[PDB]
């Protein structure tokens, strides 16, 4: 069961797309940056689908921008991701944490 | 790039590993279950590495079980994960959401 994993990853990319959009507004549209920032306080980019649904009810344009961005970002990641390398880096990190233990000796 | 994505994925498998070990302890080792539950109240499984360092200072056996379990879970995941499928699904969900607003 890795349904939880797929969901958490989509949540994270939704989150990352929110930050990307806020960064664009900060530079290019300061009144909307303020609006969106304030919106996010009460509607947290936690669960991606719930977040997007509530955002959409107040601003379809910002919801669509987050949607497009999250999908684009996910597409760029998977073209690049080396999962075998990540597995190896976990194994490397496990062994490194064990070594730290010997140091406290 | 996307190093943040890697770090988060690793955090999440670490957390899923913690949950897996808790579930083992729940029936098979009640004294250790209550110990680990209480430990986690003040050492949260959010940054995996930091969580493991702190856990290791008090119980290297639990840290090791979480390390092995996170790695094996990641292994099982990558063997079947279909990332093209996930992409298609994010897209479909985007469309569904947009259609909810057309209705409303």
Curated annotation (Swiss-Prot), chain A:
Q: Where are the transmembrane segments?
A: none
Transit peptide in keyword set:
yes
Keywords attached to this entry: Carbon dioxide fixation, Chaperone, Chloroplast, Photosynthesis, Plastid, Transit peptide
Q: What induces it?
A: Not regulated by cold, salt or desiccation.
Predominant localisation class: plastid
GO CC term, one of those recorded: chloroplast stroma
Gene Ontology molecular functions: protein folding chaperone
Q: Where in the cell is it found?
A: Plastid, Chloroplast stroma
One of this protein's GO BP terms? Answer: photosynthesis
* Superkingdom of the source species: Eukaryota
Its function, per the record, reads:
Chaperone involved in RuBisCO assembly process.
Q: Which family does it belong to?
A: Belongs to the RbcX family.
| Quaternary structure annotation from Swiss-Prot or TrEMBL | Homodimer. Interacts with rbcL, atpB and RBCS-1B.
Q: Output this protein's name.
A: Chaperonin-like RbcX protein 2, chloroplastic
Species name = Arabidopsis thaliana (Mouse-ear cress)
